[PDB]
Structure formats: structure tokens, C-alpha cells
Amino acid sequence: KDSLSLMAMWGSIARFDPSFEGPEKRLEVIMRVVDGTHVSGLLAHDDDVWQKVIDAICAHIVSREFNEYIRSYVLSE
Amino acid sequence: XSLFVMKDRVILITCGTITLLNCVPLICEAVSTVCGEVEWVSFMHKNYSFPWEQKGPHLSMAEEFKTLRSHFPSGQPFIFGPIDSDHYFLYFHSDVVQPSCSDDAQLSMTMYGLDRNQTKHWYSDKMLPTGPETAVIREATGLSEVVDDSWILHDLQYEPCGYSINAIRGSEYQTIHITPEEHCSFASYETNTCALNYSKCICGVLRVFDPERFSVIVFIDPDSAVGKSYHSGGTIGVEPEYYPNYEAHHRTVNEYTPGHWVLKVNYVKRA
Amino acid sequence: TRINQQTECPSSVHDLVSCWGSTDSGLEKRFELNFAQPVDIGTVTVKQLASVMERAGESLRQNSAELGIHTLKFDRSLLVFTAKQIVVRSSVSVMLHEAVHPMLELMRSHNIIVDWASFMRVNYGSPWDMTSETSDIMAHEYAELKSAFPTGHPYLAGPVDRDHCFYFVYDGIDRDPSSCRRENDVQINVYMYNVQEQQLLVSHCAGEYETLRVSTHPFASFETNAVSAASDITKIVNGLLKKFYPERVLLVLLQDRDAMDRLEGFTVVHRGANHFGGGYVFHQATYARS
Ligand SMILES: NC(=[NH2+])c1cccc(/C=N/N/C(N)=[NH+]/N=C/c2cccc(C(N)=[NH2+])c2)c1
């Protein structure tokens, strides 16, 4: 492995004790609006679209809440 | 974990060993269907506590870098903080052809070694969606103060342990995820709330968990409220004065892209 | 196409490197020690410093003695020794990490306490370029450094895939109110990539110096710890850019416990700062010719 990941591993080893991974991965994608962009943007899609996205990572939606600005989904492995 | 879909973006938060980057092709497709154009992509994660168990591209920062480079060749990786201790890995891609106004906000917290009296309430022998049972947990631990009645919330108590909650109020959101095991105690908090000072927001979370150590990272946009305050010598709520029981161990400041800044601080509780 | 291999956790950093671990792409390495108490200029001999650098494959060629400064010039490295610090800068073909432990033993034999140390390398290429040995060397550098300073930590200032500084810092400075260990050091570093061979030191004051290394793609490396330099970083860098006219530039400025916006004809690539728990800050900015 690379030296930087090697250093990060040693720091984790020194804090290891015989374990679930709490620290999270975060992905954010922001799109530009053009003349032909849907007036609702990404909110135009239905939950079908976002469920297929979660399937790509081998997870599923457990609950849903939406408002006029944001769609919120809880996920579980 | 959490998926926050807004008018102009997606925010996907995952934990465990989920291979988050596999969904990039469909996100790109989701943007092309509504006739949008990707202009800004960020991949970020606190250093993993057990990197030897991550799979796919996430087994090493070189693999995450190479994977993201195969899709976003102009992106740039960064590492903020001590590499053999608490730090963040960031990959940032931007294709901003039309200058715009950046007034967003992002506040993330990573907490370890959680209060032992509190971890009791994050355990359960049965699965419990948002209902009367979780309401007891939110009051019994203090999450009610962080997520008051003005927020639309929906949480989940896991079996045998584990807790997640999402909250939304207008265009703002709020999320928390808890791992209460004693030997790997961890809790996370993130929000995009606009605030001239995050001290009360942060302290509210610390009151719930009171962790042995924690890190806070703040992305500052130039045209945001916190941005104007930060760029005018003003305090933003992450300074050491707001945490007398904690000692700042290392702090980083980076203008990762022109006009945009990120601040990270590691705090360790004093004896 | 991976399986799980139940294996032992390395008991030391050295076991982790050997077990779980083009030429070096860096441009310069820098190794520094500071002392809990100032050292008599003459207690550490030129012979002893030279035997340490033999462990890194360097042979002494020239050395001069001045007021508060001892300068040792090797084939590919320059060593400055004052009452407050030892600083050696070398090319990347020098395995400078091999001098860490011998140098510490030498200080130990003289009853000299090291309470602060740094190892720094300036890279143009990424450590994730698997066709290069940069990653294997950095892993060995980390082994020696972390082995000697378990409390030290590595840091990466700047874009990993562009001009950046990887450095390792150990801070064991005694900061009890009753301590006489003040921290008002000046450190200013100017790295100039692709300029248009020598190792020089100019001394204007006792214990304060300016060093310049020119090597190879030609690059020049300037350093100074002069208090007068801290009051006008703007002037000195402009004089360097005129004399060398590089394509890219990397600046590092020390803001010690007891205490860069634009360069002429250069656009800012990255700007950042590392604020250490000890109160001091390392500022860094990289630039590219417009
Ligand atoms: N929303 C999320 N994706 C989320 C958020 C926060 C924590 C967790 C993890 N819960 N699980 C924890 N903390 N511990 N592990 C529990 C466990 C123990 C034995 C077996 C299993 C299992 N279902 N295989 C789980 C999951």
C-alpha cells in the first residue's frame, strides 16, 4: 500500500482493541442549471430513481421525509 | 447512512464498509435526465478507524484517488491534519464555467469515546422506526434539544445497537449517526445551517455525547453569513475559548479552491 | 478479487513497513533538531557530525567556522549547526532518514535533550505514483521518524497531486510556566521550481544565516532564520524570483508561539496553514507563473 495510507493504518493500530466503522464517507454533487433544466431540478425524480442509486451501493431506504426544498432518506446496510 | 436530495445537489452519507463511490454513474445520469450539468463534486471522509476492513476503492487513499480520477480527472486530493491520527481526506472537483454566488454552509463533527451513561439508550433488542419509543430516547439523551419541534425528524434505533436520525427544516438539514459500542464509541453530526457562530450548535451536540475527543470541520463559502464573519476577523464558534474542558491539539486552514476555505480542529478532553 | 487474511498487527512501525508495505520524485529533504537548552558551539565536533552523515551516504568535503555557526558541506547536503538547532538540507538521492537515529544518539552522548524535531520533503510528484519509489522511501522515513519520536506526527501541506510539503513534527517542548524555553524562531523557506550547482551560506548576524542550494530540471532552495527576514518577506522573495525566474514557487513561513497574498507575475495555486497545538503555525502557499 501507499505510504500515506500506511501511516493512517499505524495510527489506527495504536488505537485498536480486540468493531463497527463509525466514521462516514460523504459524497456531494452539485449541478449547474441551464435553459432546459427541469424547474424542479433533481427533485423532479421520484423515489424510484434514488432507490436504484442506493442499490448500486448495496443498501436500502428505511424511511422517507420530504418538504418543498429537500428529500431526506434514512439508509441501512 | 443518509441521502439528502435537494433542487441542485445530492448529499450521500454512508458508514461501515459500504462502497459509496459505486453510485457515481447513476448520480451523473440523474443529473443528465433533468438536463443539468455537474459543476462541483466532493468526496470526503474522516480517517477510518479500521482501514484494513474497507473494500473496493476505499482500502487505501490511493485507490479512492485513482477511482475518483477515472471519473473526474481534474479533481485534487487533500489531507487535513495528522496522517497517523485524526484527519480528513478530501477529493475536490469543480467545473465552474459561469461565476456564481456561493453562500452555502457545512458543519461536520466526529466524536469518539461517548458518554457511558448515554450509550445505554442507543441499545435495543428490536428494530424501532420513528415512533413513541425513539421519542423516549431523544428526551432521555438530549437529542430533543438539538432537534426541537421546529424540525421534521425521522430516526431509527438499530438492533442490537446503533442510532440514526435525519432532520429537515425548510432548506436546512441535520443528521446524526451513533455507534455506542464501548471499544469503538463514535458519533457524527452534520448540518448545512446558516449561523454567524456555531458554538451553541456544537456545544449542544457535545452536551449529548461529551466525547473524550472530537474533530470539527467547517467549509466556508465567500458569500455566506459565516463567510463574511470569518473574512472580517470575527469568531465563528470553533475557537478554543468556547470549549474550556477541551484542549485544541491541531488545527488546519486551507483555501482548497479560490475563494473557498475549510477549517478543521481536533479537540481532546483535558484530565 | 480479494479475500480476508487473518494476520497479526505489527508491533512496531518497522514491522508495518516491511510486512504491509522511476526514482524519488521529491526535490529536497530537510532534517532539523532543536534543543531544550542551547548547546556550546564547540562541544559537538565536526568529526562527530560527519560520522553521523556517513550513515546517510555523505562524505564531508568542506566546513567553515563562524560566529555562532558551523557549516558542513557534503556532496549532496548542507549542514548548519548553531547553539539552538541542527539543520541539514539534502538532495533526494540522500537517504537522510538514515541519519535520524545516529544524530539522536550523538545528541544523547553529549547529554543534549532534543525537545523539537522536523523532517520535511518538498515533492513535485504524488506519492501515489506507483511507478516511482517515492512511497517506499517515505514509508522508511516514517519508520525511522516515528520509531524515534512516537509522539511525533506526519502532515501533508498542499495538494497531494501537486506541489506540496510532507513533513513530520515532534514537539516535546516543556511549556510549564516555570520553563525558560522561549519560542521566537524565524523560519522562511523559498523553493523555486524550474529556474532559468552550488551550496552557499551567508552569515550577517551571530546565529542567523541564509542558505541557498541550487541543484536539479533545475531548482533553487532558499532558507533563512534571520529576525530581519521576518519583517520583510516580500522584498527577499522578489529578489529571488528575479534572479532565478522560476515557473512554480513554494513558500513556507514559520509563525512561532511568540510571534504571501500575491506574487508578481504568479497566480496562487494553493494556500494553507498548519496550526500546531504548541501555538506555532506553519504557513504555506504555492504559485505558478501566469
Ligand atoms: N444509518 C446507518 N447506516 C448507521 C448509522 C449509525 C450506526 C450504524 C451501525 N449500527 N451498528 C452498530 N453500531 N454496531 N453493530 C451492531 C451489530 C452487531 C452484530 C451483528 C450485526 C449485524 N446486523 N450483522 C450488527 C448504522
Author numbering:
A (entry chain A): 5 to 22, 27 to 85
B (entry chain B): 86 to 356
C (entry chain F): 4 to 24, 32 to 206, 219 to 238, 243 to 285, 294 to 324
What does the paper say about this structure?
AdoMetDC is a pyruvoyl-dependent enzyme that catalyzes formation of decarboxylated AdoMet, a substrate required for biosynthesis of the polyamine spermidine from putrescine. The AdoMetDC pyruvoyl group plays a key role in the catalytic mechanism and derives from an autocatalytic processing reaction that cleaves the peptide backbone into β- and α-chains. Trypanosomatid AdoMetDC undergoes this cleavage, while the corresponding pseudoenzyme, which we call ‘prozyme’, lacks key residues and is not processed to the active form.
TbAdoMetDC/prozyme wild-type heterodimer was crystallized with putrescine both in the absence (apo-TbAdoMetDC/prozyme) and presence (CGP-TbAdoMetDC/prozyme) of CGP 40215 (CGP), a known AdoMetDC inhibitor. The CGP-TbAdoMetDC/prozyme structure additionally has CGP bound in the active site and a second putrescine (Put) found in a novel site near the N-terminal α-helix (h1). Comparison of CGP-TbAdoMetDC/prozyme heterodimer with the apo-TbAdoMetDC/prozyme structure shows that conformational changes upon ligand binding are limited to the movement of a couple of residues in the flexible connector arm (e.g. R26) adjacent to h1 and the active site. In the presence of ligand R26 repositions to form an interaction with the π electrons in the benzamidine ring of the inhibitor. CGP binds in the TbAdoMetDC active site with one amidine group buried 3.6 Å above the active site pyruvoyl group. CGP forms H-bonds with the backbone carbonyl of L83, the side chain hydroxyls of S249 and Y243, and with C100, suggesting C100 may be unprotonated leading to formation of an ion pair with the amidine of the inhibitor. The buried benzyl ring is sandwiched between Y243 and F28 forming π-π stacking interactions with the former and the guanidine group nitrogens (N01 and N03) form a bidentate H-bond with E266. The amidine of the second benzamidine group is solvent exposed. Furthermore, the active conformation is likely stabilized and perhaps regulated by pathway metabolites since putrescine is bound in the h1 helix pocket forming H-bonds with both h1 residues and residues forming the h1 binding pocket, such as H172. The fully activated T. brucei enzyme has a conformation and active site structure similar to the human enzyme however two residues within the 4 Å CGP 402015 inhibitor contacting surface differ between the human and T. brucei structures (TbR26/HsH5 and TbY243/HsF223).
